[PDB]
Design a protein around this ligand. Structure first.
Ligand SMILES: C[C@@H]1O[C@H](CNS(=O)(=O)c2cccs2)[C@@H](O)[C@H](O)[C@@H]1O
Ligand SMILES: C[C@@H]1O[C@H](CNS(=O)(=O)c2cccs2)[C@@H](O)[C@H](O)[C@@H]1O
Ligand SMILES: C[C@@H]1O[C@H](CNS(=O)(=O)c2cccs2)[C@@H](O)[C@H](O)[C@@H]1O
Ligand SMILES: C[C@@H]1O[C@H](CNS(=O)(=O)c2cccs2)[C@@H](O)[C@H](O)[C@@H]1O
Ligand SMILES: [Ca+2]
Ligand SMILES: [Ca+2]
Ligand SMILES: [Ca+2]
Ligand SMILES: [Ca+2]
Ligand SMILES: [Ca+2]
Ligand SMILES: [Ca+2]
Ligand SMILES: [Ca+2]
Ligand SMILES: [Ca+2]
Lengths: 114, 114, 114, 114
Protein backbone atom coordinates (compact mmCIF):
# COMPACT_ATOMS: atom_id res chain seq x y z
CA UNK A 1 0.00 0.00 0.00
CA UNK A 2 0.99 3.63 -0.42
CA UNK A 3 2.30 5.00 2.88
CA UNK A 4 3.22 8.46 4.07
CA UNK A 5 0.19 10.20 2.55
CA UNK A 6 -2.35 11.93 4.79
CA UNK A 7 -5.49 13.97 4.30
CA UNK A 8 -5.58 16.89 6.73
CA UNK A 9 -8.43 19.32 7.18
CA UNK A 10 -8.11 22.24 4.74
CA UNK A 11 -6.17 25.39 5.57
CA UNK A 12 -4.82 24.01 8.84
CA UNK A 13 -1.48 24.83 10.47
CA UNK A 14 0.45 21.69 11.30
CA UNK A 15 3.82 20.76 12.67
CA UNK A 16 6.28 18.43 10.98
CA UNK A 17 9.36 17.10 12.79
CA UNK A 18 11.93 14.57 11.68
CA UNK A 19 14.42 12.45 13.65
CA UNK A 20 17.33 10.36 12.30
CA UNK A 21 18.62 6.95 13.40
CA UNK A 22 20.91 5.66 10.69
CA UNK A 23 24.47 5.72 9.41
CA UNK A 24 22.99 7.17 6.17
CA UNK A 25 22.29 10.82 5.56
CA UNK A 26 18.50 11.19 5.45
CA UNK A 27 16.58 13.53 3.13
CA UNK A 28 12.97 14.08 4.14
CA UNK A 29 10.75 15.80 1.54
CA UNK A 30 7.41 17.26 2.67
CA UNK A 31 4.77 17.98 -0.01
CA UNK A 32 1.57 19.85 0.45
CA UNK A 33 -0.97 19.52 -2.43
CA UNK A 34 1.79 18.08 -4.61
CA UNK A 35 4.37 20.82 -4.08
CA UNK A 36 7.52 20.45 -2.00
CA UNK A 37 7.29 22.84 0.93
CA UNK A 38 10.09 21.60 3.25
CA UNK A 39 13.22 19.55 3.07
CA UNK A 40 15.14 18.22 5.99
CA UNK A 41 18.62 16.77 5.55
CA UNK A 42 20.69 15.29 8.33
CA UNK A 43 22.42 12.40 9.93
CA UNK A 44 22.30 10.84 13.39
CA UNK A 45 22.39 7.43 15.00
CA UNK A 46 20.93 8.92 18.24
CA UNK A 47 17.54 10.43 17.31
CA UNK A 48 18.72 13.93 16.56
CA UNK A 49 16.08 16.27 15.24
CA UNK A 50 16.98 16.94 11.62
CA UNK A 51 14.13 19.42 11.13
CA UNK A 52 10.97 20.92 12.59
CA UNK A 53 8.68 23.29 10.76
CA UNK A 54 5.19 24.76 10.83
CA UNK A 55 3.25 24.44 7.57
CA UNK A 56 -0.28 24.96 6.22
CA UNK A 57 -2.30 22.15 4.65
CA UNK A 58 -3.78 24.47 2.02
CA UNK A 59 -6.98 24.03 0.13
CA UNK A 60 -6.58 20.35 -0.61
CA UNK A 61 -5.23 19.16 2.72
CA UNK A 62 -2.90 16.62 1.04
CA UNK A 63 0.35 16.01 2.90
CA UNK A 64 2.94 13.55 1.67
CA UNK A 65 6.27 12.44 3.20
CA UNK A 66 9.05 10.95 1.14
CA UNK A 67 12.40 9.83 2.45
CA UNK A 68 15.60 9.06 0.54
CA UNK A 69 19.15 8.13 1.34
CA UNK A 70 21.75 8.61 -1.40
CA UNK A 71 19.00 9.19 -3.90
CA UNK A 72 17.31 5.82 -3.07
CA UNK A 73 13.74 5.93 -1.77
CA UNK A 74 13.31 4.40 1.65
CA UNK A 75 10.45 2.01 2.35
CA UNK A 76 7.78 3.77 4.43
CA UNK A 77 5.34 2.76 7.14
CA UNK A 78 2.65 5.10 8.45
CA UNK A 79 -0.61 5.63 10.27
CA UNK A 80 -2.74 8.43 11.68
CA UNK A 81 -4.00 8.40 15.26
CA UNK A 82 -6.62 10.74 16.74
CA UNK A 83 -6.98 11.27 20.50
CA UNK A 84 -10.11 12.76 22.16
CA UNK A 85 -11.61 13.09 18.67
CA UNK A 86 -9.49 16.20 18.12
CA UNK A 87 -5.73 15.78 18.60
CA UNK A 88 -4.09 14.35 15.49
CA UNK A 89 -0.77 12.60 14.83
CA UNK A 90 0.36 11.45 11.38
CA UNK A 91 3.30 9.13 11.86
CA UNK A 92 5.96 7.85 9.42
CA UNK A 93 8.81 5.42 9.79
CA UNK A 94 11.29 4.62 7.07
CA UNK A 95 13.82 1.89 6.27
CA UNK A 96 16.92 2.62 4.22
CA UNK A 97 18.38 -0.89 4.39
CA UNK A 98 17.33 -4.41 5.41
CA UNK A 99 17.55 -4.56 9.24
CA UNK A 100 13.88 -3.43 9.30
CA UNK A 101 14.01 -1.16 12.33
CA UNK A 102 11.98 1.47 10.38
CA UNK A 103 13.49 4.27 12.41
CA UNK A 104 16.09 5.54 9.97
CA UNK A 105 14.08 8.70 9.51
CA UNK A 106 11.05 9.09 11.79
CA UNK A 107 8.55 11.82 10.96
CA UNK A 108 5.79 13.18 13.22
CA UNK A 109 3.07 15.45 11.92
CA UNK A 110 0.82 17.06 14.59
CA UNK A 111 -2.24 19.26 14.53
CA UNK A 112 -3.93 21.43 15.66
CA UNK A 113 -1.38 24.05 16.67
CA UNK A 114 -1.75 27.24 18.67
CA UNK B 1 -8.49 6.23 33.11
CA UNK B 2 -4.86 6.97 33.84
CA UNK B 3 -3.18 8.46 30.82
CA UNK B 4 0.43 9.17 30.00
CA UNK B 5 1.87 5.89 31.36
CA UNK B 6 3.66 3.47 29.02
CA UNK B 7 5.49 0.15 29.38
CA UNK B 8 8.61 0.11 27.26
CA UNK B 9 10.93 -2.87 26.80
CA UNK B 10 13.48 -2.98 29.62
CA UNK B 11 16.81 -1.20 29.38
CA UNK B 12 15.96 0.39 26.03
CA UNK B 13 16.99 3.79 24.71
CA UNK B 14 14.08 6.02 23.74
CA UNK B 15 13.56 9.56 22.53
CA UNK B 16 11.22 12.00 24.27
CA UNK B 17 10.28 15.28 22.60
CA UNK B 18 7.84 17.95 23.85
CA UNK B 19 6.09 20.68 21.89
CA UNK B 20 4.14 23.69 23.21
CA UNK B 21 0.96 25.36 21.92
CA UNK B 22 -0.35 27.56 24.70
CA UNK B 23 -0.07 31.00 26.25
CA UNK B 24 0.89 29.19 29.48
CA UNK B 25 4.37 28.04 30.41
CA UNK B 26 4.35 24.25 30.19
CA UNK B 27 6.18 21.92 32.57
CA UNK B 28 6.65 18.38 31.35
CA UNK B 29 7.98 15.84 33.84
CA UNK B 30 9.35 12.54 32.54
CA UNK B 31 9.53 9.70 35.07
CA UNK B 32 11.29 6.41 34.50
CA UNK B 33 10.41 3.67 37.03
CA UNK B 34 8.83 6.29 39.29
CA UNK B 35 11.76 8.69 39.42
CA UNK B 36 11.93 11.99 37.56
CA UNK B 37 14.68 11.85 35.00
CA UNK B 38 13.93 14.95 32.87
CA UNK B 39 11.84 18.09 33.13
CA UNK B 40 11.08 20.31 30.14
CA UNK B 41 9.90 23.86 30.70
CA UNK B 42 8.95 26.26 27.96
CA UNK B 43 6.37 28.39 26.23
CA UNK B 44 5.18 28.68 22.63
CA UNK B 45 2.04 29.18 20.67
CA UNK B 46 3.62 27.80 17.53
CA UNK B 47 4.68 24.29 18.31
CA UNK B 48 8.21 25.06 19.46
CA UNK B 49 10.19 22.17 20.80
CA UNK B 50 10.63 22.76 24.52
CA UNK B 51 12.71 19.70 25.04
CA UNK B 52 14.17 16.62 23.38
CA UNK B 53 16.28 13.97 25.10
CA UNK B 54 17.46 10.39 24.79
CA UNK B 55 16.73 8.35 27.89
CA UNK B 56 16.86 4.73 29.02
CA UNK B 57 13.76 2.83 30.18
CA UNK B 58 15.68 1.04 32.92
CA UNK B 59 14.85 -2.27 34.49
CA UNK B 60 11.12 -1.86 34.79
CA UNK B 61 10.44 -0.09 31.55
CA UNK B 62 7.88 2.27 33.12
CA UNK B 63 7.68 5.70 31.54
CA UNK B 64 5.21 8.34 32.76
CA UNK B 65 4.54 11.83 31.47
CA UNK B 66 3.01 14.51 33.68
CA UNK B 67 2.18 17.99 32.51
CA UNK B 68 1.41 21.08 34.53
CA UNK B 69 1.11 24.85 34.16
CA UNK B 70 2.11 26.91 37.22
CA UNK B 71 1.74 23.87 39.44
CA UNK B 72 -1.75 22.92 38.17
CA UNK B 73 -2.01 19.46 36.44
CA UNK B 74 -3.22 19.46 32.87
CA UNK B 75 -5.74 16.87 31.65
CA UNK B 76 -3.93 14.20 29.62
CA UNK B 77 -4.83 12.04 26.67
CA UNK B 78 -2.56 9.29 25.32
CA UNK B 79 -2.06 6.11 23.30
CA UNK B 80 0.71 3.88 21.94
CA UNK B 81 0.91 2.89 18.28
CA UNK B 82 3.25 0.30 16.79
CA UNK B 83 4.10 0.21 13.06
CA UNK B 84 5.52 -2.89 11.35
CA UNK B 85 5.58 -4.62 14.74
CA UNK B 86 8.77 -2.69 15.46
CA UNK B 87 8.49 1.11 15.41
CA UNK B 88 6.84 2.49 18.53
CA UNK B 89 5.24 5.82 19.32
CA UNK B 90 3.88 6.75 22.74
CA UNK B 91 1.79 9.88 22.32
CA UNK B 92 0.54 12.42 24.87
CA UNK B 93 -1.66 15.50 24.55
CA UNK B 94 -2.65 17.81 27.35
CA UNK B 95 -5.21 20.52 28.04
CA UNK B 96 -4.47 23.40 30.44
CA UNK B 97 -7.71 25.33 29.98
CA UNK B 98 -11.17 25.16 28.44
CA UNK B 99 -10.90 25.17 24.65
CA UNK B 100 -10.14 21.41 24.49
CA UNK B 101 -7.54 21.53 21.75
CA UNK B 102 -5.39 19.10 23.85
CA UNK B 103 -2.21 20.47 22.24
CA UNK B 104 -1.02 22.73 25.01
CA UNK B 105 1.92 20.42 25.58
CA UNK B 106 2.30 17.56 23.17
CA UNK B 107 4.77 14.76 23.94
CA UNK B 108 6.15 12.13 21.55
CA UNK B 109 8.15 9.17 22.82
CA UNK B 110 9.80 7.01 20.10
CA UNK B 111 11.81 3.80 20.04
CA UNK B 112 13.88 2.00 18.98
CA UNK B 113 16.79 4.30 18.35
CA UNK B 114 20.03 3.72 16.45
CA UNK C 1 -11.19 14.12 28.41
CA UNK C 2 -14.40 12.92 26.87
CA UNK C 3 -13.93 9.42 25.40
CA UNK C 4 -16.01 7.25 23.09
CA UNK C 5 -17.07 10.07 20.75
CA UNK C 6 -16.04 9.97 17.08
CA UNK C 7 -16.69 12.21 14.07
CA UNK C 8 -17.35 10.13 10.93
CA UNK C 9 -17.96 11.37 7.40
CA UNK C 10 -21.65 12.19 6.86
CA UNK C 11 -24.13 9.58 5.60
CA UNK C 12 -21.48 6.78 5.77
CA UNK C 13 -22.15 3.15 6.54
CA UNK C 14 -20.09 1.80 9.40
CA UNK C 15 -19.78 -1.39 11.40
CA UNK C 16 -20.05 -1.58 15.18
CA UNK C 17 -19.12 -4.75 17.07
CA UNK C 18 -19.01 -5.29 20.83
CA UNK C 19 -17.25 -7.97 22.86
CA UNK C 20 -17.74 -8.72 26.58
CA UNK C 21 -15.13 -9.73 29.16
CA UNK C 22 -16.75 -9.29 32.54
CA UNK C 23 -18.90 -10.93 35.18
CA UNK C 24 -21.32 -8.05 34.77
CA UNK C 25 -23.99 -7.80 32.11
CA UNK C 26 -22.90 -5.06 29.69
CA UNK C 27 -25.28 -2.57 28.07
CA UNK C 28 -23.68 -0.79 25.11
CA UNK C 29 -25.60 2.23 23.82
CA UNK C 30 -24.74 3.45 20.35
CA UNK C 31 -25.87 7.00 19.59
CA UNK C 32 -25.76 8.54 16.19
CA UNK C 33 -26.26 12.33 16.16
CA UNK C 34 -27.37 12.26 19.76
CA UNK C 35 -30.05 9.59 19.40
CA UNK C 36 -29.82 5.97 20.42
CA UNK C 37 -29.79 3.74 17.33
CA UNK C 38 -28.57 0.42 18.79
CA UNK C 39 -28.34 -1.25 22.16
CA UNK C 40 -26.29 -4.32 22.75
CA UNK C 41 -26.91 -6.25 25.95
CA UNK C 42 -24.95 -9.31 26.88
CA UNK C 43 -22.58 -11.09 29.18
CA UNK C 44 -19.41 -13.11 28.78
CA UNK C 45 -16.05 -13.55 30.49
CA UNK C 46 -14.51 -14.95 27.27
CA UNK C 47 -14.90 -12.33 24.56
CA UNK C 48 -18.25 -13.30 23.19
CA UNK C 49 -19.70 -10.97 20.62
CA UNK C 50 -22.68 -9.23 22.21
CA UNK C 51 -23.61 -7.28 19.10
CA UNK C 52 -22.60 -6.48 15.57
CA UNK C 53 -24.56 -4.13 13.36
CA UNK C 54 -24.22 -1.93 10.32
CA UNK C 55 -25.32 1.66 10.90
CA UNK C 56 -25.29 4.96 9.11
CA UNK C 57 -23.57 8.03 10.47
CA UNK C 58 -26.36 10.34 9.25
CA UNK C 59 -26.18 14.00 8.49
CA UNK C 60 -23.90 15.03 11.34
CA UNK C 61 -21.56 12.07 11.47
CA UNK C 62 -21.46 11.96 15.25
CA UNK C 63 -21.08 8.51 16.83
CA UNK C 64 -20.97 8.04 20.58
CA UNK C 65 -20.51 4.86 22.62
CA UNK C 66 -21.72 4.61 26.20
CA UNK C 67 -21.43 1.52 28.40
CA UNK C 68 -23.19 0.68 31.66
CA UNK C 69 -23.42 -2.24 34.04
CA UNK C 70 -26.31 -2.52 36.50
CA UNK C 71 -27.25 1.13 35.53
CA UNK C 72 -23.74 2.46 36.54
CA UNK C 73 -21.70 4.15 33.73
CA UNK C 74 -18.41 2.46 32.96
CA UNK C 75 -15.26 4.52 32.55
CA UNK C 76 -14.20 4.68 28.85
CA UNK C 77 -10.96 4.81 26.92
CA UNK C 78 -10.80 5.40 23.15
CA UNK C 79 -8.87 6.38 20.05
CA UNK C 80 -9.18 6.37 16.29
CA UNK C 81 -6.60 4.96 13.90
CA UNK C 82 -6.41 5.36 10.14
CA UNK C 83 -4.44 2.99 7.91
CA UNK C 84 -3.36 3.79 4.33
CA UNK C 85 -5.21 7.13 4.69
CA UNK C 86 -8.45 5.20 4.04
CA UNK C 87 -9.26 2.43 6.50
CA UNK C 88 -10.71 3.64 9.78
CA UNK C 89 -11.01 2.06 13.22
CA UNK C 90 -12.68 3.74 16.19
CA UNK C 91 -11.82 1.81 19.36
CA UNK C 92 -13.38 1.83 22.83
CA UNK C 93 -12.57 0.00 26.02
CA UNK C 94 -14.62 0.20 29.19
CA UNK C 95 -14.08 -0.52 32.85
CA UNK C 96 -16.96 -1.44 35.18
CA UNK C 97 -14.93 -2.01 38.34
CA UNK C 98 -11.46 -1.55 39.92
CA UNK C 99 -9.09 -3.95 38.05
CA UNK C 100 -8.51 -1.51 35.17
CA UNK C 101 -8.39 -4.07 32.36
CA UNK C 102 -10.68 -1.83 30.27
CA UNK C 103 -11.91 -4.88 28.43
CA UNK C 104 -15.28 -5.33 30.18
CA UNK C 105 -17.02 -4.21 27.02
CA UNK C 106 -14.79 -3.66 23.99
CA UNK C 107 -16.25 -1.87 21.02
CA UNK C 108 -14.77 -1.70 17.49
CA UNK C 109 -16.19 0.66 14.88
CA UNK C 110 -14.95 0.22 11.27
CA UNK C 111 -15.43 2.01 7.96
CA UNK C 112 -15.65 2.14 5.02
CA UNK C 113 -17.74 -0.90 4.22
CA UNK C 114 -18.54 -2.60 0.93
CA UNK D 1 7.29 -3.58 4.96
CA UNK D 2 5.90 -6.86 6.29
CA UNK D 3 2.43 -6.25 7.62
CA UNK D 4 0.04 -8.40 9.63
CA UNK D 5 2.65 -9.70 12.11
CA UNK D 6 2.28 -8.97 15.81
CA UNK D 7 4.11 -9.82 19.03
CA UNK D 8 1.81 -10.73 21.83
CA UNK D 9 2.82 -11.58 25.39
CA UNK D 10 3.69 -15.27 25.69
CA UNK D 11 0.98 -17.81 26.42
CA UNK D 12 -1.83 -15.25 26.32
CA UNK D 13 -5.45 -15.74 25.31
CA UNK D 14 -6.58 -13.40 22.55
CA UNK D 15 -9.60 -12.83 20.37
CA UNK D 16 -9.48 -12.77 16.56
CA UNK D 17 -12.43 -11.59 14.48
CA UNK D 18 -12.64 -11.22 10.68
CA UNK D 19 -15.07 -9.12 8.64
CA UNK D 20 -15.62 -9.20 4.89
CA UNK D 21 -16.37 -6.35 2.44
CA UNK D 22 -15.74 -7.66 -1.05
CA UNK D 23 -17.33 -9.55 -3.93
CA UNK D 24 -14.42 -12.03 -3.56
CA UNK D 25 -14.49 -14.94 -1.13
CA UNK D 26 -11.91 -14.17 1.56
CA UNK D 27 -9.62 -16.77 3.19
CA UNK D 28 -8.00 -15.56 6.40
CA UNK D 29 -5.17 -17.67 7.79
CA UNK D 30 -4.15 -17.14 11.46
CA UNK D 31 -0.71 -18.45 12.41
CA UNK D 32 0.67 -18.71 15.90
CA UNK D 33 4.48 -19.16 16.04
CA UNK D 34 4.53 -19.99 12.34
CA UNK D 35 1.82 -22.64 12.41
CA UNK D 36 -1.74 -22.24 11.14
CA UNK D 37 -4.23 -22.39 14.03
CA UNK D 38 -7.38 -21.01 12.38
CA UNK D 39 -8.77 -20.42 8.91
CA UNK D 40 -11.79 -18.25 8.22
CA UNK D 41 -13.51 -18.45 4.83
CA UNK D 42 -16.46 -16.29 3.84
CA UNK D 43 -17.97 -13.61 1.67
CA UNK D 44 -19.87 -10.43 2.36
CA UNK D 45 -20.17 -6.92 1.01
CA UNK D 46 -21.76 -5.70 4.26
CA UNK D 47 -19.23 -6.36 6.96
CA UNK D 48 -20.44 -9.79 8.00
CA UNK D 49 -18.28 -11.57 10.53
CA UNK D 50 -16.66 -14.51 8.73
CA UNK D 51 -14.93 -15.80 11.83
CA UNK D 52 -14.36 -15.18 15.49
CA UNK D 53 -12.25 -17.34 17.78
CA UNK D 54 -10.32 -17.31 21.02
CA UNK D 55 -6.75 -18.51 20.64
CA UNK D 56 -3.49 -18.67 22.61
CA UNK D 57 -0.29 -16.91 21.59
CA UNK D 58 1.95 -19.78 22.66
CA UNK D 59 5.49 -19.66 23.86
CA UNK D 60 6.82 -17.26 21.27
CA UNK D 61 3.85 -14.88 21.17
CA UNK D 62 4.03 -14.49 17.36
CA UNK D 63 0.69 -13.98 15.61
CA UNK D 64 0.50 -13.54 11.86
CA UNK D 65 -2.49 -12.84 9.60
CA UNK D 66 -2.51 -13.73 5.91
CA UNK D 67 -5.37 -13.09 3.53
CA UNK D 68 -6.02 -14.54 0.07
CA UNK D 69 -8.75 -14.61 -2.54
CA UNK D 70 -8.82 -17.52 -5.02
CA UNK D 71 -5.27 -18.38 -3.99
CA UNK D 72 -3.89 -14.82 -4.65
CA UNK D 73 -2.35 -13.06 -1.65
CA UNK D 74 -4.02 -9.82 -0.77
CA UNK D 75 -1.95 -6.73 0.05
CA UNK D 76 -2.05 -6.02 3.79
CA UNK D 77 -1.98 -2.96 6.00
CA UNK D 78 -1.68 -3.12 9.78
CA UNK D 79 -0.88 -1.49 13.10
CA UNK D 80 -1.21 -2.12 16.81
CA UNK D 81 -2.74 0.36 19.21
CA UNK D 82 -2.67 0.24 23.01
CA UNK D 83 -5.10 2.14 25.18
CA UNK D 84 -4.50 2.94 28.87
CA UNK D 85 -1.29 0.97 28.60
CA UNK D 86 -3.40 -2.19 28.95
CA UNK D 87 -5.94 -2.73 26.17
CA UNK D 88 -4.48 -3.99 22.93
CA UNK D 89 -5.80 -3.99 19.41
CA UNK D 90 -3.89 -5.51 16.47
CA UNK D 91 -5.55 -4.35 13.24
CA UNK D 92 -5.31 -5.64 9.70
CA UNK D 93 -6.84 -4.47 6.42
CA UNK D 94 -6.44 -6.16 3.11
CA UNK D 95 -6.90 -5.34 -0.57
CA UNK D 96 -7.78 -7.96 -3.18
CA UNK D 97 -8.09 -5.72 -6.22
CA UNK D 98 -7.62 -2.16 -7.48
CA UNK D 99 -9.92 0.18 -5.56
CA UNK D 100 -7.62 0.41 -2.49
CA UNK D 101 -10.36 0.40 0.14
CA UNK D 102 -8.28 -2.10 2.18
CA UNK D 103 -11.49 -3.45 3.77
CA UNK D 104 -11.91 -6.58 1.68
CA UNK D 105 -11.08 -8.60 4.77
CA UNK D 106 -10.66 -6.70 8.02
CA UNK D 107 -9.14 -8.53 11.01
CA UNK D 108 -9.18 -7.40 14.65
CA UNK D 109 -7.11 -9.08 17.33
CA UNK D 110 -7.88 -8.05 20.94
CA UNK D 111 -6.32 -8.81 24.33
CA UNK D 112 -6.44 -9.25 27.23
CA UNK D 113 -9.57 -11.31 27.72
CA UNK D 114 -11.47 -12.17 30.84
C1 LIG E 1 23.50 2.17 11.92
C2 LIG E 1 22.61 1.49 10.89
O1 LIG E 1 22.58 2.29 9.66
C3 LIG E 1 21.81 1.63 8.64
C4 LIG E 1 21.92 2.32 7.30
N1 LIG E 1 23.36 2.24 7.00
S1 LIG E 1 23.78 2.75 5.52
O2 LIG E 1 25.22 2.70 5.49
O3 LIG E 1 23.22 4.04 5.27
C5 LIG E 1 23.15 1.70 4.39
C6 LIG E 1 23.64 0.40 4.13
C7 LIG E 1 22.83 -0.14 3.12
C8 LIG E 1 21.84 0.73 2.61
S2 LIG E 1 21.82 2.26 3.43
C9 LIG E 1 20.34 1.60 9.10
O4 LIG E 1 19.37 1.02 8.20
C10 LIG E 1 20.26 0.73 10.33
O5 LIG E 1 18.93 0.59 10.90
C11 LIG E 1 21.19 1.25 11.42
O6 LIG E 1 20.61 2.47 11.94
C1 LIG F 1 -3.43 30.65 23.35
C2 LIG F 1 -4.27 29.67 24.19
O1 LIG F 1 -3.64 29.46 25.44
C3 LIG F 1 -4.44 28.66 26.33
C4 LIG F 1 -3.86 28.67 27.72
N1 LIG F 1 -4.03 30.07 28.18
S1 LIG F 1 -3.40 30.40 29.64
O2 LIG F 1 -3.69 31.78 29.84
O3 LIG F 1 -2.13 29.88 29.74
C5 LIG F 1 -4.32 29.65 30.84
C6 LIG F 1 -5.46 30.27 31.45
C7 LIG F 1 -6.01 29.44 32.35
C8 LIG F 1 -5.33 28.22 32.55
S2 LIG F 1 -3.95 28.11 31.51
C9 LIG F 1 -4.57 27.26 25.71
O4 LIG F 1 -5.33 26.34 26.48
C10 LIG F 1 -5.32 27.42 24.40
O5 LIG F 1 -5.48 26.15 23.73
C11 LIG F 1 -4.55 28.34 23.48
O6 LIG F 1 -3.30 27.68 23.11
C1 LIG G 1 -14.73 -11.25 35.80
C2 LIG G 1 -14.48 -9.81 36.24
O1 LIG G 1 -15.67 -9.08 36.19
C3 LIG G 1 -15.57 -7.70 36.63
C4 LIG G 1 -16.88 -7.09 36.89
N1 LIG G 1 -17.58 -7.89 37.92
S1 LIG G 1 -19.06 -7.40 38.34
O2 LIG G 1 -19.67 -8.42 39.16
O3 LIG G 1 -19.85 -6.98 37.24
C5 LIG G 1 -18.90 -6.01 39.21
C6 LIG G 1 -18.63 -5.97 40.58
C7 LIG G 1 -18.53 -4.64 41.03
C8 LIG G 1 -18.78 -3.70 40.03
S2 LIG G 1 -19.06 -4.44 38.48
C9 LIG G 1 -14.67 -7.00 35.61
O4 LIG G 1 -14.55 -5.61 35.90
C10 LIG G 1 -13.31 -7.67 35.69
O5 LIG G 1 -12.47 -7.10 34.70
C11 LIG G 1 -13.40 -9.16 35.36
O6 LIG G 1 -13.62 -9.30 33.95
C1 LIG H 1 -17.52 -5.21 -4.34
C2 LIG H 1 -16.03 -5.03 -4.58
O1 LIG H 1 -15.36 -6.27 -4.61
C3 LIG H 1 -13.95 -6.19 -4.94
C4 LIG H 1 -13.38 -7.52 -5.28
N1 LIG H 1 -13.91 -7.99 -6.59
S1 LIG H 1 -13.49 -9.54 -6.96
O2 LIG H 1 -14.44 -10.04 -7.96
O3 LIG H 1 -13.41 -10.36 -5.79
C5 LIG H 1 -11.97 -9.57 -7.61
C6 LIG H 1 -11.70 -9.40 -9.00
C7 LIG H 1 -10.33 -9.46 -9.20
C8 LIG H 1 -9.58 -9.68 -8.01
S2 LIG H 1 -10.56 -9.85 -6.58
C9 LIG H 1 -13.24 -5.40 -3.82
O4 LIG H 1 -11.83 -5.21 -4.03
C10 LIG H 1 -13.89 -4.03 -3.77
O5 LIG H 1 -13.32 -3.21 -2.71
C11 LIG H 1 -15.40 -4.06 -3.54
O6 LIG H 1 -15.59 -4.43 -2.14
CA1 LIG I 1 17.18 0.49 9.18
CA1 LIG J 1 18.13 2.59 12.16
CA1 LIG K 1 -5.96 24.28 25.26
CA1 LIG L 1 -3.46 25.23 22.67
CA1 LIG M 1 -12.66 -4.60 34.52
CA1 LIG N 1 -12.69 -7.70 32.35
CA1 LIG O 1 -10.87 -3.58 -2.35
CA1 LIG P 1 -14.05 -3.73 -0.42
Amino acid sequence: ATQGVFTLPANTQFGVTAFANSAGTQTVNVQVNNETVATFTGQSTNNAIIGSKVLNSGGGGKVQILVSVNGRSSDLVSAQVILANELNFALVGSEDSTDNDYNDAVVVINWPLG
